[PDB]
Amino acid sequence: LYDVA
Amino acid sequence: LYDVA
Amino acid sequence: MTEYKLVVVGAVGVGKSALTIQLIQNHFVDEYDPTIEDSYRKQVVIDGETCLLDILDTAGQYMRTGEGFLCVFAINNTKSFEDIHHYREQIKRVKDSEDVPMVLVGNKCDLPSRTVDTKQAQDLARSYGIPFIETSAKTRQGVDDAFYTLVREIRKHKE
Amino acid sequence: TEYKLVVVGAVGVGKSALTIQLIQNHFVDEYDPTIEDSYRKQVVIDGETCLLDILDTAGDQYMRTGEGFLCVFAINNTKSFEDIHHYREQIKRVKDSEDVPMVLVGNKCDLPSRTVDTKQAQDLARSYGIPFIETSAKTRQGVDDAFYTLVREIRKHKE
Amino acid sequence: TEYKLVVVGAVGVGKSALTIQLIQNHFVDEYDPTIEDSYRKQVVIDGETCLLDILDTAGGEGFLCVFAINNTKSFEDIHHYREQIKRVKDSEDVPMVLVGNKCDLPSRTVDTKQAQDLARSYGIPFIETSAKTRQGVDDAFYTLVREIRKHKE
Amino acid sequence: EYKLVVVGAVGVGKSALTIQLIQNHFVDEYDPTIEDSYRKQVVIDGETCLLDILDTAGYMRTGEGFLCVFAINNTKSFEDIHHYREQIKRVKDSEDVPMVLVGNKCDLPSRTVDTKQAQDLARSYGIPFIETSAKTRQGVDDAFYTLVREIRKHKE
Amino acid sequence: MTEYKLVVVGAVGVGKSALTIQLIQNHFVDEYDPTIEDSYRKQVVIDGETCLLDILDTAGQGEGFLCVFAINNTKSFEDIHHYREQIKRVKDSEDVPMVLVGNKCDLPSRTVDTKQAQDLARSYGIPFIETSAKTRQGVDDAFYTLVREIRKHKE
Amino acid sequence: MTEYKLVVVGAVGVGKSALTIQLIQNHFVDEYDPTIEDSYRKQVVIDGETCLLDILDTAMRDQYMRTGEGFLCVFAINNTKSFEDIHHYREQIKRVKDSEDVPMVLVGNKCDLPSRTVDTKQAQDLARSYGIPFIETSAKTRQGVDDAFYTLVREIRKHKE
Numbered sequence: 001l002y003d004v005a
Numbered sequence: 006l007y008d009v010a
Numbered sequence: 011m012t013e014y015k016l017v018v019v020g021a022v023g024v025g026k027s028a029l030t031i032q033l034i035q036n037h038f039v040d041e042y043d044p045t046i047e048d049s050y051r052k053q054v055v056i057d058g059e060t061c062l063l064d065i066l067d068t069a070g071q072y073m074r075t076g077e078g079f080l081c082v083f084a085i086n087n088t089k090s091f092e093d094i095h096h097y098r099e100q101i102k103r104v105k106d107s108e109d110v111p112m113v114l115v116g117n118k119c120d121l122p123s124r125t126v127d128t129k130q131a132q133d134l135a136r137s138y139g140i141p142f143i144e145t146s147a148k149t150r151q152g153v154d155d156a157f158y159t160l161v162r163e164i165r166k167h168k169e
Numbered sequence: 170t171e172y173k174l175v176v177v178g179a180v181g182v183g184k185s186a187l188t189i190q191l192i193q194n195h196f197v198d199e200y201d202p203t204i205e206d207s208y209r210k211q212v213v214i215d216g217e218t219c220l221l222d223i224l225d226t227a228g229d230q231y232m233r234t235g236e237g238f239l240c241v242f243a244i245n246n247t248k249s250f251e252d253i254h255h256y257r258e259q260i261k262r263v264k265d266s267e268d269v270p271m272v273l274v275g276n277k278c279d280l281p282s283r284t285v286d287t288k289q290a291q292d293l294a295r296s297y298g299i300p301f302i303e304t305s306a307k308t309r310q311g312v313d314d315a316f317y318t319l320v321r322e323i324r325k326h327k328e
Numbered sequence: 329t330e331y332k333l334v335v336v337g338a339v340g341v342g343k344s345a346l347t348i349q350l351i352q353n354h355f356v357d358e359y360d361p362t363i364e365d366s367y368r369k370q371v372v373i374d375g376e377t378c379l380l381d382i383l384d385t386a387g388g389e390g391f392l393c394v395f396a397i398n399n400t401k402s403f404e405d406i407h408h409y410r411e412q413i414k415r416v417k418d419s420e421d422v423p424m425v426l427v428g429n430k431c432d433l434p435s436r437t438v439d440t441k442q443a444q445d446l447a448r449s450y451g452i453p454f455i456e457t458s459a460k461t462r463q464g465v466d467d468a469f470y471t472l473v474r475e476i477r478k479h480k481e
Numbered sequence: 482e483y484k485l486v487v488v489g490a491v492g493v494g495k496s497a498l499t500i501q502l503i504q505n506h507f508v509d510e511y512d513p514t515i516e517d518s519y520r521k522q523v524v525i526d527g528e529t530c531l532l533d534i535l536d537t538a539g540y541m542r543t544g545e546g547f548l549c550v551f552a553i554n555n556t557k558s559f560e561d562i563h564h565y566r567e568q569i570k571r572v573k574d575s576e577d578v579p580m581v582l583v584g585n586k587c588d589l590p591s592r593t594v595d596t597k598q599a600q601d602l603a604r605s606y607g608i609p610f611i612e613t614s615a616k617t618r619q620g621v622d623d624a625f626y627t628l629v630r631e632i633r634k635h636k637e
Numbered sequence: 638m639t640e641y642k643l644v645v646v647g648a649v650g651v652g653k654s655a656l657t658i659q660l661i662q663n664h665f666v667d668e669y670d671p672t673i674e675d676s677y678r679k680q681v682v683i684d685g686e687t688c689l690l691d692i693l694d695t696a697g698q699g700e701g702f703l704c705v706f707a708i709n710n711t712k713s714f715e716d717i718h719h720y721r722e723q724i725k726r727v728k729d730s731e732d733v734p735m736v737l738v739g740n741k742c743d744l745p746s747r748t749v750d751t752k753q754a755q756d757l758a759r760s761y762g763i764p765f766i767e768t769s770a771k772t773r774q775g776v777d778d779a780f781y782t783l784v785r786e787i788r789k790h791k792e
Numbered sequence: 793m794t795e796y797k798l799v800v801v802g803a804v805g806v807g808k809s810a811l812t813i814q815l816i817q818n819h820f821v822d823e824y825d826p827t828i829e830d831s832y833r834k835q836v837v838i839d840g841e842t843c844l845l846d847i848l849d850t851a852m853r854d855q856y857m858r859t860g861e862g863f864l865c866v867f868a869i870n871n872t873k874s875f876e877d878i879h880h881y882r883e884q885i886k887r888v889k890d891s892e893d894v895p896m897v898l899v900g901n902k903c904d905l906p907s908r909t910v911d912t913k914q915a916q917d918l919a920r921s922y923g924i925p926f927i928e929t930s931a932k933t934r935q936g937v938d939d940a941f942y943t944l945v946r947e948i949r950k951h952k953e
């Protein structure tokens with residue numbers, strides 16, 4: 001529920 | 006990381 | 011019985027002991043070994059109250075039961091003044107708390123050898139709310155005021 | 170005298186930029202929406218001497234003693250504008266109260282690249298009575314007014 | 329189409345913390361200031377596509393002379409750094425940008441005045457980064473490219 | 482006919498002031514761990530006097546004028562002035578010794594010790610202040626010359 | 638150059654240092670060790686003139702003396718004559734400039750009326766002000782008015 | 793942006809640098825080593841504009857004495873040799889630039905001294921014999937110190953348009 005792309 | 010100088 | 015367990019953090023050569031041993035032992039410590047730390051104590055008629063300052067003149071190299079810490083920099087320094095965050099976040103890290111009673115005091119204000127204007131020595135202290143005073147163990151300025159104002163900060167936090 | 174505020178919102182709206190333009194005074198080019206400290210600053214609020222211990226939340230002790238929430242959307246967004254109920258009810262969900270002091274502000278009104286007209290940014294805010302303002306941390310517009318107006322909302326609720 | 333940048337500065341300022349935050353994306357809690365690789369990354373720099381092959385030195389087109397806003401020694405070491413860069417390139421006009429790192433800290437002494445009139449004493453841009461926030465972190469390197477573009481044309 | 486001393490820390494430019502006024506060129510580097518008793522005649526201030534100077538690095542009894550010097554691109558040095566203020570008053574066991582606090586190396590744009598500090602401190606003894614930089618020969622001679630005025634004063 | 642060498646005499650507990658250090662170093666000394674004394678100094682734009690105050694904050698154990706009592710004292714107010722005649726005794730003169738000031742007048746816990754703090758001051762001609770280092774009241778005017786007394790005695 | 797590359801030519805002992813370091817570094821240079829010459833600079837709110845004075849006290853040097861957009865040819869008003877080296881540094885400036893129309897301003901420096909011989913007449917008819925403006929500076933005073941540099945920009949601006 002975060003990460004990057 | 007004690008030293009005198 | 012009424013008591014308080016206080017700590018005195020800071021760098022070496024600022025005056026950590028000079029405050030501990032001018033408020034307690036009552037005379038300007040010409041020099042005290044910064045590589046030792048005893049847990050000093052003294053009863054004083056603190057604020058219309060009878061309290062026992064079991065202080066600790068720490069030097070690194072207790073700090074759980076630290077009720078009120080005395081994080082202290084030097085006004086004729088700057089390295090000691092930039093170590094505030096590294097002595098600040100230390101105190102928060104151990105107590106794992108972002109609201110621990112404290113007071114950042116500016117020691118050795120008796121020198122004209124001074125650089126850290128009261129501005130920096132406020133906006134920073136204002137940046138944790140916590141009080142600020144300007145001591146000088148050669149004079150006994152806010153020396154007692156520094157410790158006394160920590161007690162109120164302890165009284166507050168609980169209630 | 171003191172208040173412990175919170176700033177809720179999505180990523181990319183401006184949550185911290187308001188907290189770090191009212192407090193630290195400069196447009197933060199980019200502040201990671203993945204870290205949150207409990208910032209603070211004393212200001213001469215509204216004929217009064219008050220402490221804004223804010224919190225730039227990014228999804229304890231605060232999200233309960235959140236005396237006033239800065240639920241904020243972006244005027245050049247749309248999903249963030251649509252996210253405020255999941256932020257509207259969240260605030261009411263925890264506090265289990267249908268009357269919590271909050272102010273819906275519209276951030277980044279500095280952009281001409283905008284779609285969310287003031288109508289939206291009113292009839293929605295009129296559907297909670299709580300005030301609305303239009304901020305932009307690149308300008309410091311209603312930046313202080315959003316926080317200031319929240320204080321009036323706290324003072325009211327109690328009395 | 330690329331640019332070859334360098335990052336000079338003292339120990340304890342945050343030379344690498346910028347250099348790995350903007351390239352590898354995370355605040356390096358502590359990077360041993362005794363090593364230096366020639367880092368690189370492709371980014372859509374400013375309406376263009378360029379390759380920032382950098383080098384955070386510790387003891388060439390655009391240097392990143394960097395001081396710490398919570399320092400003083402590093403701030404006063406910039407001539408020993410601003411002459412060094414001029415000394416190598418035997419040129420009195422080499423593109424650079426003096427940035428003030430780690431402005432996230434309230435334990436700060438170097439006011440923005442110092443961190444301007446000094447930068448204004450070479451014209452070269454000034455920003456204030458803090459690799460714990462990614463503030464002007466990219467802005468510092470991005471602005472350096474602009475300084476490279478100028479000098480040619 | 483004056484015996485002067487140049488007190489200061491390492492890295493301020495103690496030697497740079499003594500060898501640019503006397504030997505006339507910017508000393509690219511002087512090994513501070515050494516100290517001669519340097520001298521030079523100059524037609525000081527409408528008068529003919531001999532500057533037998535001393536670039537101390539840690540006379541200290543006949544030091545008629547101490548050139549207590551800090552670096553405007555330092556701070557540890559500017560803070561040490563008390564450690565050097567009291568030194569001079571300690572030896573001479575006197576709270577009134579002719580001196581002049583000068584801010585050396587004002588040529589560098591990396592300056593933090595503003596002229597305010599470099600005055601209210603100097604104002605906290607009355608003793609004059611100037612701003613030298615041996616790369617320029619600015620107040621370099623002015624610092625030594627104005628010390629002479631302070632020696633003449635104390636006597637009369 | 639223009640200067641004045643002043644001395645601040647009085648008992649312990651009045652605030653001899655609180656006036657020296659609030660005029661000069663600018664902040665209420667919450668407490669100052671009454672067993673120390675430096676010869677403090679400061680340049681100020683005294684009275685349309687550029688004069689240097691090289692003061693002295695004596696505690697025992699000169700051009701103009703700042704003989705001072707506490708308005709919330711009585712022992713300190715009754716040592717004036719002994720601090721008076723001390724000043725006369727050294728300068729072996731009955732006409733030395735000074736100014737008797739009443740310090741710590743910011744306190745409501747006061748007993749020494751302005752009457753006493755005048756009839757006594759009127760019994761040497763020399764002025765009288767009421768200072769309080771917590772406020773910076775006549776603090777400077779106490780020192781400033783001394784300079785005029787020095788200027789007078791000369792010409 | 794808005795930049796201007798200026799040069800300060802003159803003899804030794806007039807105060808070429810004193811004007812460069814009073815306008816920029818803001819204090820009276822009691823004595824500056826005449827054997828050195830850096831390319832000083834400073835941003836100022838010039839004349840309803842924002843311009844950058846990259847100056848050069850002469851005593852890259854090709855790069856400047858070649859794009860010296862405006863030269864500050866300066867004599868001392870308590871001199872005469874420096875005032876006679878007028879024709880030697882202005883032919884110099886028009887030699888390199890191979891131009892008889894180079895923006896410049898002849899200033900009379902150190903007009904603070906009562907020991908002056910070069911009347912304002914000389915210090916006009918000559919400046920009138922290139923049209924270029926004249927002012928009277930003194931770095932210990934900051935008189936026309938900035939006025940000399942500011943008026944040079946006007947001459948740079950004009951020459952183009």
Ligand SMILES: Nc1nc2c(ncn2[C@@H]2O[C@H](COP(=O)(O)OP(=O)(O)O)[C@@H](O)[C@H]2O)c(=O)[nH]1
Nearest residue numbers: 021022023024025026027028040041042043044
């Ligand atoms: N002998 C000596 N004393 C110093 C030096 N630097 C500071 N002091 C004095 O030492 C006093 C108190 O020492 P302190 O700083 O409390 O020891 P620490 O706090 O454990 O490092 C201060 O009031 C200073 O004035 C030094 O280099 N040598």
Ligand SMILES: Nc1nc2c(ncn2[C@@H]2O[C@H](COP(=O)(O)OP(=O)(O)O)[C@@H](O)[C@H]2O)c(=O)[nH]1
Nearest residue numbers: 179180181182183184185186198199200201202
């Ligand atoms: N150029 C650029 N700017 C960005 C980008 N992401 C964020 N920003 C800027 O940073 C702000 C969004 O991040 P921010 O609002 O501070 O995160 P939050 O406050 O925690 O929600 C916006 O105002 C943008 O101007 C990006 O990818 N590129």
Ligand SMILES: Nc1nc2c(ncn2[C@@H]2O[C@H](COP(=O)(O)OP(=O)(O)O)[C@@H](O)[C@H]2O)c(=O)[nH]1
Nearest residue numbers: 338339340341342343344345357358359360361
């Ligand atoms: N892991 C760790 N990091 C620290 C500590 N103290 C400071 N830091 C962070 O580590 C960084 C220092 O590394 P850095 O300055 O990048 O090394 P340099 O640029 O090569 O000199 C600073 O930005 C601090 O924020 C510590 O005790 N431990």
Ligand SMILES: Nc1nc2c(ncn2[C@@H]2O[C@H](COP(=O)(O)OP(=O)(O)O)[C@@H](O)[C@H]2O)c(=O)[nH]1
Nearest residue numbers: 490491492493494495496497508509510511513
């Ligand atoms: N730029 C530069 N200057 C240096 C270097 N090494 C030494 N110096 C100079 O060496 C001088 C220190 O010696 P000096 O001041 O004459 O000795 P002192 O009089 O006893 O303090 C400084 O003025 C520096 O300018 C170097 O590597 N680079």
Ligand SMILES: Nc1nc2c(ncn2[C@@H]2O[C@H](COP(=O)(O)OP(=O)(O)O)[C@@H](O)[C@H]2O)c(=O)[nH]1
Nearest residue numbers: 648649650651652653654655666667668669671
């Ligand atoms: N810690 C402490 N400080 C005091 C006490 N009484 C007075 N002071 C401080 O000492 C200051 C007065 O200094 P003063 O007595 O006038 O100097 P002196 O008269 O020459 O000894 C007052 O402003 C108080 O702040 C006391 O009982 N304890």
Ligand SMILES: Nc1nc2c(ncn2[C@@H]2O[C@H](COP(=O)(O)OP(=O)(O)O)[C@@H](O)[C@H]2O)c(=O)[nH]1
Nearest residue numbers: 803804805806807808809810822823824825826
């Ligand atoms: N009386 C006197 N004045 C001097 C002497 N040497 C230099 N000066 C003064 O120092 C100033 C030097 O100006 P400066 O900017 O260094 O000249 P520049 O190098 O040609 O630009 C002149 O205005 C002179 O009045 C000297 O031996 N005697």
Ligand SMILES: [Mg+2]
Nearest residue numbers: 025026027028
């Ligand atoms: Mg200690």
Ligand SMILES: [Mg+2]
Nearest residue numbers: 184185201202
């Ligand atoms: Mg954020």
Ligand SMILES: [Mg+2]
Nearest residue numbers: 343344360361
């Ligand atoms: Mg490194």
Ligand SMILES: [Mg+2]
Nearest residue numbers: 495496512513
């Ligand atoms: Mg030496």
Ligand SMILES: [Mg+2]
Nearest residue numbers: 653654670671
């Ligand atoms: Mg006393």
Ligand SMILES: [Mg+2]
Nearest residue numbers: 808809849851
């Ligand atoms: Mg010159």
